[PDB]
Amino acid sequence: MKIIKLYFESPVHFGEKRLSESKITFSADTLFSALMIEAVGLGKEDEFYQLASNNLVKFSDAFPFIDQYYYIPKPMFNLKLFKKLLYVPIDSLEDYLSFNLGKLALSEKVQQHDFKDSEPYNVGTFTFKENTGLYVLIEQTHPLLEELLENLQYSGIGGKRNSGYGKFKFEILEDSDIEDLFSAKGNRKILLSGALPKDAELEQALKNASYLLERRGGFVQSDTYATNLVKKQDLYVFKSGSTFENSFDGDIYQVGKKGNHPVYKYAKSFFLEVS
Template sequence: MEFILYKLHFKTGVHIGDGGLSGSEYTLPSDTFFSALCHETVKQGLDIKEWVNAVRSKELVFSDGLPFIESRIYIPKPLKPVLAEKTSSPKFKKAFKKLKYIPVDKLDEYMAGDLKADDEEKTLSGLGVFETHEKNSIKTYTETEPYQIGIYRFKRGNGIYFCVGYKKEKTIALFERLLQGLSFTGVGGKISSGYGKFETEKANVPFTMEKRLKSKNAKTYMTLSFCLPKENELESAMQNAYYLVGKRSGFVQSQNYAESFVKKKDMYLFRSGSCFSVQFEGDIYDVSSGGNHPVYRYGKPLFLEVD
């Protein structure tokens, strides 16, 4: 499998839901991104089954949308504990707990407990700024109700990237076609208000990162995406695992699914940063609930060697 980075440079602010309109995250979960790609597939009149099957069969995998600052690539902080003797003081514990993302070239330094967490947190704070935009909801012809939308605006040269692994040229060509379409539509929430539009830059995966992505004999692997093992993989995946789970829900956006808005089935996925002693395949899960067609949830891991 070959790997490539797709950097998203946003031309507008982006709203990535954190459970409410008034806030926003600055990273994009892989399952949310996959749903957007599925919508773009249908919008372009392409075969949705061909796209889903390509991803399900691991012809193509991708990470969450993760931060980059100019040429520096960030990954989630591994949930596997660092060396305790290096971080036993309250000051170190607080700094390491606060840190969410680390430079990929400092992974060994982090696991050894030698990373200057306060300095890295300060650097990451330069990624962009949070903003609150005032909007009006039209309730009647004569009445409006104000509300707030949380927006994240990346500083010039910064943004989020997707690390993409692929096996076939035709599959990566399809992905690039869909990504190009999304650049005009936008990603995240409130795209009808003009948020989430971006330009794409292709970049090589740093050598040390690529080596970790291709490793098959590591002691510990970290997932860079939201994922869930298949039922027959779950028991082995849980052995010596360090993980957090996130509830994934939402409404079906397809106009052809039902006559009214219908909620997707709730799922709990392992969050990116979760660490495992074995690799697993995961799957594309159907979270439809009695509508006219399947509704897909991305649950495939993209593993990176930790140690």
């Protein structure tokens, strides 16, 4: 199982709902949407969507990491039992059965007008400090994914493009001693992506589930989608650090029907199994 570390040269902008906010990570559907926008850029769309349909490029969502420590959100354990804590190391969770990523900011901008008044607007952002960043986790690495990732570091992950925030230089630095945790089978499962199981396996997936729904879905960009900006069908996934017993497996839902090309949303499971 593989790592893709992302070292950022610049402040980033990952919004929940609006522009003036930011968060410190970006979910899996954001990464998938970005990568197949780049595959639109180089004409390998359908092959990429089939490669993610056949579950060869299943991947995690992005997580904070500091120098040689990789973190995850605190798993919502439904035990007898810190409320200001957010993340714990992935090799340090079972003992729970020294955190500084950066600082958020509001770089604040204007639109100039010639004769009209100048139009001010503020953009929320977050800055990663020096030996920090983000990383994701994929499964069974693919050369086409390597071909598409290098086109994304030169066109900007993040919200606001092309001016001028989210930018990075990726590096695999393949795993050594963390995929054993993935191979460590356990009695208590931890999701690590914004998954939505299909309707067949949804009701069996709440035997002890301690989840959190999280709305996902925004506007749709293209040169050829719908002749103006339309929303997408908001789809309602579980939050990343959820906790289960019954492992499901979600899928990638088409939420674009009205425009000529479709619009997809990656939501399939990526589990960490512990005691």
